[PDB]
Amino acid sequence: GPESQLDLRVQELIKLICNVQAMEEMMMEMKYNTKKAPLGKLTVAQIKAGYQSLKKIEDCIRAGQHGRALMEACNEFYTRIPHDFGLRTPPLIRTQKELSEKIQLLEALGDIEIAIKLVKSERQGLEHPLDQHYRNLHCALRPLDHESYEFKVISQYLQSTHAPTHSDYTMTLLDLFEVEKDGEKEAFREDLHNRMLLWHGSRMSNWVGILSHGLRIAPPEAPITGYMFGKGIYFADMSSKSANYCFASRLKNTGLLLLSEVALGQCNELLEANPKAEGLLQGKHSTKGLGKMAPSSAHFVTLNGSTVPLGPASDTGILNPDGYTLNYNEYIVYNPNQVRMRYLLKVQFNFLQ
């Protein structure tokens, strides 16, 4: 047929992120019943109806209801968002934690609905299908040389900010791409101080949606208690805190990890979870969940106007007297115009045992 005009490394990335069969397998792993509700029949309306049912579940949880009312709320959720629990009676979502853990399923379904729409796109024999998928992302992806300065600095950031408690794996950088998503530069809050190059990880199934639509905030219908610091976009300064969100496995041990310039401006610093954090900003530009360990000023470098908080991380002196303390920082912005995606890392996860 027509030959691909793409760099082979980009060809490889497209193949990885547009593989729908991998998306089915991953959703099967999350217990979504792809036989009852095939992924090619996912709609936005189904997913929003999903979020609405989770809101009804949140209502029950807030009321302390563990009986028929919660049974029916969960039944409604599981009808709209079919699960496979074997020969068990479907388990109730009884606590805020269980509820919060279910949001990721709806988020993956959202990004898969996007991915399937894109791969099923009309298509013209004029261009190789990889090239057609790439074009449809409206996101430039430029592979960098392993000998480049970029590759050296990012490799150093990846390694030096692998957190000591994320000891289950190491990471190897296999490939690196500069990212330029159409529209992101033009929207970006260049005016804001505290511009940092921060990590964001996600499941393999999500990247067509992320690269084509940008990082997005939860919809209005979603239950607020599902988000530790509210409906924003979350980032780490420690590579492995974000890489944990790739949910790589021993069998699927290749993931993608994103670095983005994040216009934090003035952070509202919090020790503890507060799903209503956004209403606390009062003029501030972002939320910072304070961790016990973080990169220090001493080791920082800049790349294209952004601070790269290279490690090693050291103790921040932070300790919550009145409860739980985050091990590592988290940063949350509540507008996509505080984000510019810059690098996409292809990372191999080297698991223990």
Ligand SMILES: CNCc1ccc(-c2[nH]c3cc(F)cc4c3c2CCNC4=O)cc1
């Ligand atoms: C569990 N309720 C929904 C939810 C799911 C995931 C996250 C979350 N928190 C993070 C902190 C952080 F430093 C980095 C990341 C995240 C995420 C998911 C997005 N990816 C991150 O790397 C936030 C809320």
